[PDB]
Structure of E3 ubiquitin-protein ligase UBR4:
Amino acid sequence: GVRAIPYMQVILMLTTDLDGEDEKDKGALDNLLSQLIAELGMDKKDVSKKNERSALNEVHLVVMRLLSVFMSRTKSGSKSSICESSSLISSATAAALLSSGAVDYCLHVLKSLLEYWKSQQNDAYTQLLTEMVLRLPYQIKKITDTNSRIPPPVFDHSWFYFLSEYLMIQQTPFVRRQVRKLLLFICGSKEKYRQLRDLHTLDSHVRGIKKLLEEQGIFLRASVVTA
């Protein structure tokens, strides 16, 4: 990744001249996105190698940095019809990414780093990796929200569960704010986001009390306390 950083920088300079309105440019960009997605290797069951620092992980980190640069210039501000090209590129990128199920891979990598955080607390490459793997689903969902014609990604309850668990970590000074804003955007209303967060916090504190009394000897048997 480090030695190929100049390479994808050159790719970025080459793509800065691409116009999303032309069919040839859009097709070439879509092919490049599909090739990068296939390079991501979400089908790999070898998640254990994703936790350790490796060349493949750094290459993937550079890949999402390049993709974030691509979708970070979608501001209609001072754009000579560029706004339209940026919107088309954003929509095509979101469709290609979501249709490939990289979101499930995001869930797997998040739950893998959750084990790392659990192990480290009880006994800045990581920060950048976590920020990118949280920003990519955030940006994808934002783009799909801006374009209702793209089918919405399906988020079951587990995603909220680990996102809340990550929120319980007090080692996140600002990205915690970003995750909170992400969740209130996902719910769409502050009421539901706060309701889920409070419910998880209460459930976690309650099981904490339960197990703390279990270990001491106050046992909850059939909802009856036995000392």
